[PDB]
Every structure is written in structure tokens, then in C-alpha cells.
PDB file of C-alpha atoms in Angstrom:
ATOM      1  CA  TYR A 314     -58.938 107.528 208.926  1.00 25.79           C
ATOM      2  CA  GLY A 315     -59.891 105.121 205.836  1.00 25.26           C
ATOM      3  CA  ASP A 316     -61.025 107.522 203.235  1.00 24.88           C
ATOM      4  CA  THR A 317     -57.983 107.997 200.878  1.00 24.84           C
ATOM      5  CA  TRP A 318     -58.917 104.382 199.741  1.00 27.03           C
ATOM      6  CA  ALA A 319     -61.219 106.115 197.276  1.00 27.37           C
ATOM      7  CA  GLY A 320     -57.970 106.991 195.190  1.00 27.27           C
ATOM      8  CA  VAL A 321     -56.575 103.415 195.378  1.00 22.67           C
ATOM      9  CA  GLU A 322     -59.928 102.223 194.229  1.00 21.23           C
ATOM     10  CA  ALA A 323     -59.170 104.482 191.028  1.00 21.16           C
ATOM     11  CA  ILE A 324     -56.373 102.217 190.408  1.00 19.63           C
ATOM     12  CA  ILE A 325     -57.800  99.064 191.086  1.00 21.97           C
ATOM     13  CA  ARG A 326     -60.593 100.013 189.059  1.00 22.89           C
ATOM     14  CA  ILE A 327     -58.378  99.731 185.855  1.00 24.61           C
ATOM     15  CA  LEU A 328     -55.519  97.287 187.372  1.00 23.22           C
ATOM     16  CA  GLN A 329     -56.234  93.554 187.050  1.00 21.36           C
ATOM     17  CA  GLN A 330     -59.485  94.444 184.418  1.00 20.44           C
ATOM     18  CA  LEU A 331     -56.861  94.969 181.775  1.00 16.64           C
ATOM     19  CA  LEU A 332     -55.298  91.933 182.996  1.00 20.10           C
ATOM     20  CA  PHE A 333     -58.324  89.892 183.345  1.00 18.97           C
ATOM     21  CA  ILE A 334     -58.829  90.499 179.971  1.00 18.43           C
ATOM     22  CA  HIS A 335     -55.364  90.091 178.994  1.00 19.82           C
ATOM     23  CA  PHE A 336     -55.456  87.043 180.246  1.00 18.56           C
ATOM     24  CA  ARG A 337     -58.880  85.945 179.843  1.00 18.00           C
ATOM     25  CA  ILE A 338     -58.261  86.328 176.312  1.00 16.56           C
ATOM     26  CA  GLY A 339     -54.552  85.821 176.212  1.00 15.32           C
TER      27      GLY A 339
END
């Protein structure tokens, strides 16, 4: 009861990563 987070982690892995670069640059 706490392993499905591995799916979530796949989302976060590309979530603010694109935003941080869109924002850090833009």
C-alpha cells in the first residue's frame, strides 16, 4: 500500500522538468 507511486514518479519525472526549463529559460 504505497508502491503505485512508481507510476506517479514517471509523471513527475517529466512534469516540472519541462516547466523548470521552460521557466528557467523563459
